[PDB]
Amino acid sequence: IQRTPKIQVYSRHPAENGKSNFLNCYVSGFHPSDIEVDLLKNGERIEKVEHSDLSFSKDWSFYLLYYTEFTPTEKDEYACRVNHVTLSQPKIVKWDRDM
Amino acid sequence: GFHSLRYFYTAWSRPGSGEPRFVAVGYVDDTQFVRFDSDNASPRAEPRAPWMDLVEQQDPQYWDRNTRNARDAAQTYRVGLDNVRGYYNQSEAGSHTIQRMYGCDVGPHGRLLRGYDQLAYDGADYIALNEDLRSWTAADLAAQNTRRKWEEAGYAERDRAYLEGECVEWLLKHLENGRETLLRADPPKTHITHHPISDREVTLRCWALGFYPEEITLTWQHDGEDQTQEMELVETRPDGNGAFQKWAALVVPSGEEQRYTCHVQHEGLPQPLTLRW
């Protein structure tokens, strides 16, 4: 029984340009657990990215949080690239500071 | 009120890429406090909550006693993966997963309320401890095998004894040592934002930030008329600092923003909030 990841890209604190924040990509509801998650700054992977320990929900589906320390600007584009066995193509979700 | 100590185990094969991996985590209520990852060189259980730093002085043996258990668990589920796949006669080339979710709920009485021990295989229910803490409910033919060996090995009784003693005792210790983190209810920081779609439609988004515990309700009301099906509600999500966030949004006509209200309920709130743009 397999399940496609849900994705939410967002920040720990409301985006104040030039202030330091955290960029979060939260993937939930997937199965099996092996997942490929990257944070992108202008199409380029960010190296120093950490993530929480693997757990799962009442319906056995897994969730992880990926996060990196960042400082939003007016112009920099950020995203989250996710691949999974269930995804024939990677999903790339753009950061939006409003959701 | 009630609280819960839980343990989540994940074990899965990686055909080709090496031996099976076993990751276990533990939670009190809605916050992790320990972890164990079999892919470490000499893997040990580790603290994942600041209040766990003072666990050694109440009982230093904690970390060794735990590490030994995690290592053994790790072995038990490696062997399990092989027997279960064998029951099904599945090709060794496919990855497969065994899960586990056991713990206890205790209440204002400081006595148990529910114990549980449940297993999934490839993400579906496989076998679970019945609420009587003595029989097992097997999901399919292959899980009868697991049940029979577990019946004969007396594992239900091993579970009941743990769930009704050690589990309760430790859930109470943790609540005591984690009293600042664990016995709080941080109400959400709420506000509303405003994003114009066109000149005749505008998106209202109602934000709940930095709250704990996870359980929360957010709704929109149009002149006191609930708007649940008309609204977009995101899954609750962690902020990375031990709290949670959530929003609800809905599109309203570009002059009737004033006629909508967001309603917020949460354990930390003395009364439920009503917000308006």
Numbering used by the authors:
A (entry chain B): 1 to 99
B (entry chain A): 1 to 277
Lines quoted from the article behind this entry:
To verify the uncommon peptide presentation features of bat MHC I, we determined the crystal structures of Ptal-N*01:01 in complex with the two HeV-derived peptides, HeV1 (DFANTFLP) and HeV2 (DYINTNVLP), two EBOV-derived peptides, EBOV-NP1 (DFQESADSFL) and EBOV-NP2 (DFQESADSFLL), one H17N10-derived peptide, H17N10-NP (DFEKEGYSL), and one MERS-CoV-derived peptide, MERS-CoV-S3 (DFTCSQISP). In the structure of the Ptal-N*01:01/MERS-CoV-S3 complex, the conformation of the P3–P8 residues of the peptide could not be determined due to their poor electron densities, revealing a flexible conformation in the middle region of this MERS-CoV-S3 peptide. However, the other three residues (P1-Asp, P2-Phe, and PΩ-Pro) with electron densities available adopt similar conformations as in the other five structurally determined peptides. As a 9-mer peptide, MERS-CoV-S3 possesses a Glu at P6, corresponding to the P6-Asn in 9-mer HeV2, which is the secondary anchor residue. The larger Glu may not be able to locate in the PBG, which leads to a flexible conformation of the MERS-CoV-S3. Detailed analysis indicated that Asp59, Arg65, and the P1-Asp of the peptides in all six structures of Ptal-N*01:01 form a triangular network of hydrogen bonds.
